[PDB]
Design an enzyme around this catalytic site. Structure first.
Site, short mmCIF file in Angstrom:
data_model
loop_
_atom_site.label_atom_id
_atom_site.label_comp_id
_atom_site.label_asym_id
_atom_site.label_seq_id
_atom_site.Cartn_x
_atom_site.Cartn_y
_atom_site.Cartn_z
N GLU A 54 0.86 -1.40 0.37
CA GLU A 54 0.24 0.38 0.01
C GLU A 54 1.15 1.42 -0.04
O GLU A 54 0.27 2.31 -0.40
CB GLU A 54 -0.81 -0.02 0.99
CG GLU A 54 -1.91 -0.95 0.93
CD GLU A 54 -2.71 -1.53 2.69
OE1 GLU A 54 -1.83 -1.08 3.58
OE2 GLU A 54 -3.80 -1.67 2.72
N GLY A 89 -12.32 -3.60 2.55
CA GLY A 89 -12.71 -4.56 2.32
C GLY A 89 -14.56 -3.89 2.40
O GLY A 89 -15.44 -3.39 2.98
N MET A 97 -8.63 -2.47 9.59
CA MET A 97 -7.80 -2.33 11.02
C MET A 97 -7.20 -1.27 10.98
O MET A 97 -6.80 -1.46 12.61
CB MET A 97 -6.78 -3.86 10.49
CG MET A 97 -8.07 -4.97 10.50
SD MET A 97 -6.63 -6.59 9.99
CE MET A 97 -5.80 -6.84 11.88
N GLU A 98 -7.08 -0.42 10.44
CA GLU A 98 -6.96 0.59 10.54
C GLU A 98 -7.07 2.41 11.27
O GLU A 98 -7.04 3.33 11.84
CB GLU A 98 -5.41 1.27 10.04
CG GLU A 98 -4.18 0.37 10.75
CD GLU A 98 -4.41 -0.91 9.45
OE1 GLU A 98 -5.81 -1.18 8.20
OE2 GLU A 98 -4.07 -2.33 9.73
N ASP A 104 -11.24 -6.89 -1.79
CA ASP A 104 -11.82 -8.38 -1.97
C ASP A 104 -13.76 -7.40 -0.51
O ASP A 104 -14.13 -6.44 -0.80
CB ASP A 104 -11.71 -8.94 -0.30
CG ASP A 104 -11.18 -8.35 1.01
OD1 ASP A 104 -12.24 -7.81 1.83
OD2 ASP A 104 -10.16 -8.26 0.90
N1 Q88 Z 1 -7.59 -5.05 2.03
C1 Q88 Z 1 -8.50 -5.38 3.33
N2 Q88 Z 1 -9.58 -5.86 3.59
C2 Q88 Z 1 -10.08 -6.20 4.66
C3 Q88 Z 1 -10.97 -7.32 5.28
N3 Q88 Z 1 -11.67 -8.07 4.16
N4 Q88 Z 1 -11.29 -7.01 7.14
C4 Q88 Z 1 -10.18 -6.17 7.71
N5 Q88 Z 1 -9.13 -5.24 6.59
C5 Q88 Z 1 -9.03 -5.36 5.79
N6 Q88 Z 1 -8.12 -4.83 4.99
#
Ligand code: Q88
Ligand code: Q88
Ligand code: Q88
Ligand code: Q88
Lengths: 225, 225
Positions: free
Chosen positions: B12, B78, B169-170, B193
């Protein structure tokens, strides 16, 4: 060693501020850092604020700005294990998150990506404080960005970590940050509640006692260090 | 403004490192910070590592050590909302935690103690990037220390935040830290995704594209800033 000392809440830092010699205050990015000595040791004290993020930021600032050599984290937690009474002290020989799930990539439940499942208080600090040690226990403290207040949540946590002794919101975050920044840490807590349906009520009543009891153990440790 | 730019993973940050002029590297407490300019702007780039704690530490070091004036957070997430395709970009006009429970003290679900329930990308940055804006959406990104990979978890998150567009997550950790340290932040993500049962598989396939797409939006924003 210059020692950074972190507590999440003011009640958990108050007793230590009272024992700080040649105390000075330095405001860094909106938070107050107390400098001076405690029984001869150069310390920096800080009330980080609650939770993973606030904890992690204090560790980073203590490391990068104050250049500390070690960390001690003190405060209150919720008692969940057999034999652990409200008022007891727990020295965390292991720390882990109870609210982390990156199992989709094969990590163990509780294990943050690119991190070990368990962090630990520095082994030499643990050996020393045991010697200086109040009813107390040695074991796992499980961390989560949640205040645990119900048997359903306790049982959930225990299903992942059967040996958990206490729960709270910063320990493993402080240990994760300390490990990333290459600093030894010692995590100490005194029990203010049972993390059950009444947890918020007993936390409010006993936070000052618990904060003080944990701080007293920290002071005994510094006197012997 | 000197701008700190944070990404959780190398994939990233790679495209931005390639567009960094007079690039220099500075190692601080075991992590590499890239300095230089991007289209005239003084920047510091950093791959923070994954999750709340690693994010929070990068913000603190960018603030305290590099003295940045603003933050931009980029990467993959996501897709969970109607109309959001893999490959789309989401600009977060709100951020909140989906895994925080301090409701025992009256806080709203998701609200960390002593914090607002919702953080936001800086309004002037959002207005500007909308103008410079790739299919894209404006809305809520929900953050948790968990990789979401199942419809059961998606539905859990939506039951708390029905308007959530994407999960990762951030974001909210970066915004919480930025707000605490008095810094404006802009949070951008591209979808890799659908956060479903196959999420880890599609994340692995599309992480590089998603990282690049988010970075391209960030670059377009800097060109106009
Ligand atoms: N790219 C990405 N996909 C996800 C996901 N499904 N869940 C948490 N963090 C993510 N980061
Ligand atoms: N997956 C995993 N299990 C363990 C364990 N029992 N002890 C230490 N680290 C670990 N990592
Ligand atoms: N003192 C204290 N009690 C608790 C609890 N029950 N849950 C989380 N953190 C805590 N901290
Ligand atoms: N509890 C709470 N609800 C809200 C809301 N709907 N919008 C912003 N802040 C909030 N805080």
């Amino acid at each position: 060693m210059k020692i950074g000392i972190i507590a999440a809440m003011p009640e958990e830092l108050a007793y230590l501020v009272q024992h700080l010699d040649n105390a000075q205050e330095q405001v860094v990015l909106g938070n107050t850092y107390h400098t001076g000595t405690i029984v001869s040791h150069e310390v920096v004290l800080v009330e980080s604020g609650i939770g993973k993020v606030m904890s992690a930021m204090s560790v980073a600032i203590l490391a990068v700005h104050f250049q500390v050599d070690a960390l001690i984290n003190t405060g209150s937690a919720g008692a969940v294990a057999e034999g652990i009474a409200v008022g007891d002290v727990v020295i965390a020989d292991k720390l882990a998150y109870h609210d982390v799930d990156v199992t989709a990539f094969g990590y163990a439940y509780g294990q943050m990506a690119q991190q070990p499942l368990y962090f630990e208080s520095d082994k030499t600090f643990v050996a020393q404080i045991q010697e200086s040690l109040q009813n107390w226990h040695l074991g796992l403290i499980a961390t989560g960005d949640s205040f645990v207040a119900g048997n359903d949540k306790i049982e959930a946590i225990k299903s992942h970590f059967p040996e958990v002794l206490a729960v709270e919101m910063e320990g493993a975050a402080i240990a994760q940050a300390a490990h990333a920044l290459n600093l030894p840490v010692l995590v100490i807590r005194a029990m203010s509640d049972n993390a059950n349906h009444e947890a918020n009520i007993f936390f409010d009543e006993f936070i000052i006692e618990a904060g003080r009891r944990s701080a007293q153990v920290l002071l005994a440790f510094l006197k012997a260090l």
